[PDB]
Each structure stands twice: as C-alpha cells, then as structure tokens.
Amino acid sequence: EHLLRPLPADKQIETGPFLEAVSHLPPFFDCLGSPVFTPIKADISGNITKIKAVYDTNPTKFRTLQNILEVEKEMYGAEWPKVGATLALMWLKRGLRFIQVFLQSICDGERDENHPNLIRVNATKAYEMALKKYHGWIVQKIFQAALYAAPYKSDFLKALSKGQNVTEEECLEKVRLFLVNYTATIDVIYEMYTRMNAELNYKV
Numbered sequence: 001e002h003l004l005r006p007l008p009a010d011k012q013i014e015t016g017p018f019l020e021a022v023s024h025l026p027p028f029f030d031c032l033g034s035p036v037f038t039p040i041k042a043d044i045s046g047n048i049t050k051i052k053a054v055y056d057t058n059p060t061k062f063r064t065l066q067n068i069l070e071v072e073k074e075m076y077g078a079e080w081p082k083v084g085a086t087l088a089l090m091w092l093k094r095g096l097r098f099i100q101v102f103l104q105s106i107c108d109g110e111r112d113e114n115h116p117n118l119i120r121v122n123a124t125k126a127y128e129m130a131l132k133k134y135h136g137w138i139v140q141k142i143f144q145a146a147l148y149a150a151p152y153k154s155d156f157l158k159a160l161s162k163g164q165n166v167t168e169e170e171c172l173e174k175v176r177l178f179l180v181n182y183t184a185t186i187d188v189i190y191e192m193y194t195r196m197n198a199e200l201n202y203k204v
C-alpha cells in the first residue's frame with residue numbers, strides 16, 4: 001500500500017514505480033493537521049514533480065533512474081549534473097535520506113533520557129547526516145525553526161497509525177518493515193550518484 005518495490009539484482013531502479021511510491025511520503029508530514037518539517041516536505045514534493053515531468057515525456061528513454069543520469073549527461077554536456085531531473089533527484093535523495101535516518105533512529109529507540117517524548121535528537125541526527133552540509137546559514141535557521149516546532153513523539157506515532165487500533169510497538173514494527181526496501185533504494189541511489197560523478201557539494 002506504500003512499500004517501495006524490492007531492489008532488483010541488477011540495482012536498476014524503475015523510475016515510474018519509484019516516483020509513485022515516494023509521492024506517498026509528503027502526506028505523512030500532514031498527519032497531525034498542521035504540517036510538520038515543512039521545508040523538508042516542500043523540497044521532496046517539488047523535486048518529485050520535476051523528475052516526474054521529465055519522465056512523463058519519454059518513459060522508455062527515462063525507464064530507470066540510471067537512464068535519467070545517462071541521458072541528461074549526453075543531452076546537457078558540461079552543464080550536467082547541475083541540470084534537469086539529475087539535479088532534482090540529487091536533492092530528493094537527501095530529503096529521502098533525512099526521512100530514513102529519522103525513522104530508523106526512532107525505531108532503534110534513540111532518545112534523550114531527559115526528553116523521552118520529544119523527537120529533537122532524532123531529527124537533528126537525521127538533518128546532520130542528510131542535509132546540513134548542503135545548507136547555507138540562512139537555510140539552516142529555517143530548519144531550526146522546524147526543529148523547535150517538532151511534535152511530541154507520542155503524537156507523531158499516534159498519527160502514523162491514522163485511526164487504527166494499533167499499539168506504539170506495532171506501529172514501530174510496520175515502520176521497520178517499510179525501512180528495509182526504502183533504505184536499500186536510497187543507498188543504491190547514493191552509490192549511483194558517486195559512481196557517475198553526478199554528486200555536487202554546493203550549498204543553498
């Protein structure tokens with residue numbers, strides 16, 4: 001119902017099914033009514049839309065994520081990889097990695113024992129690992145505001161089990177299952193960017 005597809009032997013990720021799966025992730029930022037972590041949500045959603053626009057023009061040409069990078073490298077020459085869907089996916093993977101590290105941290109029981117019902121330590125770890133190195137001073141401040149406003153852990157978990165009779169432990173089990181194919185997929189995308197020399201280090 002929103003699991004990602006398993007990783008193929010050949011590690012070639014199909015573009016259409018990938019976009020379909022990750023487009024179910026922005027709504028989770030809305031599970032508490034007022035959206036949470038809005039700058040992270042907005043970037044994920046905006047980058048999905050950009051990649052989908054390129055894919056939809058020629059699904060066979062852009063059948064896999066690797067095809068996008070191959071095709072755009074040829075099309076755009078020296079401007080690549082700072083172009084098109086290659087650039088949108090370079091940023092998308094960092095928002096997807098934020099979600100991965102955040103959810104894994106919560107599932108692993110990582111917390112500040114003085115604030116066991118907050119998720120600030122999990123969100124900070126995820127931000128540091130995924131996004132911080134690529135954000136200038138102004139953008140970092142925009143993220144800290146989203147940090148101070150983070151929901152309570154119990155409210156965040158209640159809201160993921162949208163109106164179901166499921167315990168916090170049962171909810172965490174479901175997130176752990178989701179994390180298996182999701183983490184593998186993000187790791188393969190990162191490895192592709194490094195292999196293809198598509199990764200850039202500029203800050204926004």
Ligand SMILES: CCCCCCCCCC(=O)O
Binds near residue numbers: 028037099160174178
């Ligand atoms: C129930 C397994 C799927 C969990 C997906 C949750 C995505 C959370 C996005 C966020 O960090 O706000």
